[PDB]
Ligand binder design. Structure first.
Ligand SMILES: Nc1ncnc2c1ncn2[C@@H]1O[C@H](COP(=O)(O)OP(=O)(O)O)[C@@H](O)[C@H]1O
Ligand SMILES: Nc1ncnc2c1ncn2[C@@H]1O[C@H](COP(=O)(O)OP(=O)(O)O)[C@@H](O)[C@H]1O
Ligand SMILES: [Mg+2]
Ligand SMILES: [Mg+2]
Lengths: 237, 237
């Protein structure tokens, strides 16, 4: 299985078709966007780190029983995945207050959330990914009630699994975003899990080591990404 | 019954205590606030119209079986109500796209929503009443799952009842906002139902006859409120 032609691309990955109608090639680019204003910069090794970081996390979730898109890595920046009919809704679980929650509610960053919060955002850059809820999914036909329930279920399961994984690595899983899609009628985890869409703080110093370093221009973005990879045991070289 | 002391006030009503610890007096002022930028304006007869308008609707909802705060009207602008431990979350049902939905999702105003949408907003002027969801209610303890389910159940019932009532009066109930509180542990409809928090369009011309006339500089606010009141059978003078 090799890339055939580019079908489409997003702000971080390029999607290619393959000879198989049910398999695609995801290419992680070095592109790094930010804010609703959207400012993009390229960071060396970024795509490769996220691709391998994603494979590692996806496998951990699969081992836990989470059905995923993953087939296998193809190169430093590419992987083979099942073609999914993506539900255009981001699922965000928050263990501590940060990002848009802090901006939206004016709550103090870092506040522990018990139980964790669960946000749903419609994927629409034009509208800056507006917040939605279950009624919207039904009314606009984005996903069935049964499938949405499954998505939330798998997200919370992923949260339980990953909070433990990151804790063992001396990290706090502040929050993260997931995207699911349908594969032959079944809900499957797709897209990616990396520091781009998940917040990770050092357990002892609370130092931010995810995309917030880029959003807040704190410097050392990729250095932080690789630091996290090393703590988890993700081979990069 | 008589007002004993002003407890507090919001942007449209003043809340007073009475000699009875379980009863309050609500005064509907002529104060009208549009745009969180609090561009207040006073409209003569506004308080009186909404007080009578609210009484009429609450009475209809009560007949339908919905528990409400209403005891009786004390004057043209005041009403005697049960003291409720208000849940700080607005419940909004949308039958057609309008207001913030249009600006939020970029959907065309007027589009019919099937099934209707249901929004939850945290009451917080400083933060412009940010949108929330059920997980927020549990995490921050604004209201239990059981009571929230009850609030939504009653809001949907109010929708079935009021859509018919307004249609009979040649009007389209576009959307509306309700607020509930607890009375000795039970969920009870409180606050108010008026053109201030509900969108109503003439069934034949679609002319707006609610607070949107003030929000969107169309003028004729009170004249519209009175026209709606009279169509419902409310005698204003
Ligand atoms: N397994 C998959 N099958 C099909 N599409 C997928 C799969 N995994 C991810 N996608 C989609 O491919 C795109 C990946 O690109 P990305 O640059 O992250 O986009 P975005 O700008 O929306 O963040 C997204 O639209 C995502 O939903
Ligand atoms: N029956 C009631 N018991 C107690 N508080 C009530 C009752 N009905 C309404 N309230 C509260 O009193 C206030 C009425 O004020 P209003 O001017 O509409 O406020 P706001 O500026 O928040 O819209 C609101 O905070 C409302 O929740
Ligand atoms: Mg993406
Ligand atoms: Mg109010």
């Amino acid at each position: 299985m090799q890339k055939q032609a580019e079908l489409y691309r997003g702000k971080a990955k390029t999607v290619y078709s393959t000879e198989n109608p049910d398999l695609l090639v995801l290419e992680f680019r070095n592109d790094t966007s930010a804010g609703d204003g959207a400012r993009i910069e390229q960071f060396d090794r970024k795509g490769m780190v996220n691709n391998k970081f994603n494979y590692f996390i996806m496998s951990k979730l699969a081992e836990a029983g989470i059905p995923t898109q993953m087939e296998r890595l193809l190169s430093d920046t590419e992987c083979l995945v099942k073609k999914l009919d993506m539900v255009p809704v981001e699922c965000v679980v928050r263990n501590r207050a940060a990002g848009s929650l802090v901006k939206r509610l004016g709550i103090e960053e870092g506040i522990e959330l018990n139980p964790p919060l669960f946000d749903l955002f419609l994927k629409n850059d034009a509208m800056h990914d507006p917040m939605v809820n279950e009624s919207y999914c039904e009314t606009f036909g984005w996903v069935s009630k049964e499938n949405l329930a499954r998505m939330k279920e798998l997200t919370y399961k992923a949260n339980d699994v990953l909070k433990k994984l990151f804790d063992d690595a001396g990290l706090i899983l502040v929050d993260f975003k997931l995207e699911f899609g349908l594969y032959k009628g079944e809900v499957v985890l797709g897209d990616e899990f990396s520091p781009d869409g998940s917040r990770l703080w050092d357990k002892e110093t609370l130092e931010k080591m995810d995309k917030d370093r880029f959003r807040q221009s704190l410097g050392g973005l990729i250095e932080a990404y690789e630091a996290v990879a090393r703590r988890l045991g993700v081979q990069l070289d």
